[PDB]
Design a protein around this ligand. Sequence first.
Ligand SMILES: *[C@@H]1O[C@H](CO)[C@@H](O[C@@H]2O[C@H](CO)[C@@H](O)[C@H](O)[C@H]2NC(C)=O)[C@H](O)[C@H]1NC(C)=O
Ligand SMILES: *[C@@H]1O[C@H](CO)[C@@H](O)[C@H](O)[C@H]1NC(C)=O
Length: 273
Amino acid sequence: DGRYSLTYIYTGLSKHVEDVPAFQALGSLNDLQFFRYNSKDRKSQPMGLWRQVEGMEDWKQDSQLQKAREDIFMETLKDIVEYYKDSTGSHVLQGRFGCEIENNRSSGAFWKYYYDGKDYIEFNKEIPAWVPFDPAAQITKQKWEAEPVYVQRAKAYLEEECPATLRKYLKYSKNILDRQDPPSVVVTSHQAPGEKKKLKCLAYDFYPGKIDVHWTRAGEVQEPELRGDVLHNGNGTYQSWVVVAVPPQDTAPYSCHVQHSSLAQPLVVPWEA
Ligand SMILES: *[C@@H]1O[C@H](CO)[C@@H](O[C@@H]2O[C@H](CO)[C@@H](O)[C@H](O)[C@H]2NC(C)=O)[C@H](O)[C@H]1NC(C)=O
Ligand SMILES: *[C@@H]1O[C@H](CO)[C@@H](O)[C@H](O)[C@H]1NC(C)=O
């Protein structure tokens, strides 16, 4: 088996401006985002290719769960601002938590919070206990540990529940995370009035992201003039391109090359002037 990771991220603002939710949650599996939730709609919604996967999660229930998480998250943020006696300003609390497995074996886990960009508090499941970094975090740790069961639960979440959720999801995500979609390529050239002729090789609809795309001038790999790429999450596909300017009197042969894990061998696509 391979490497898989479930990550969640919470963003809370103490004084949100118009059109920006006070609380936002998102989650991802490896390089793709699978869901989202904010304090405006208050609904957990699947995203990307997960909008078509059925029976992996009850989104109506997860909505109730996020709503609960939100309340606690924002009270935490509120208590910090209270501590610093400065609710006139705009502060943010971002939290990150998730786990990862490799070869069906749990290979790691984390749980950390940031306040106004600085490390606030994090959980060390080995102890098991919360570690405070900011003075206000001393109060927070006190609260999150007022009962013996609390740390036991936090330890249980990273060691059992989370890695469980990740396994459940991989069962319904084989047709998503394990894909090996070969790249379609399209060579095209554009002539800017006054500038050299420019050839653009585009690789698309491929996955995973790792790819090699380069032009060749009579066999000699050229140094791209421009270059870029992207990941369309709604689709779960990547696109990558390269560009080269050609002398106004160059006859040499121009062929694009593409290598990718899903290809039995590299592809080649010459440009017909
Ligand atoms: C996945 O989504 C991407 C982005 O929405 C698709 O790329 C677009 O493809 C159309 C042609 O079908 C172009 O007109 C757009 O310009 C492309 N988007 C841009 C601006 O990059 C892609 O075709 C989709 N792939 C699949 C297989 O669904
Ligand atoms: C790990 O994967 C196996 C199948 O390969 C599955 O039966 C098992 O429940 C998973 N985790 C464990 C060790 O419980």
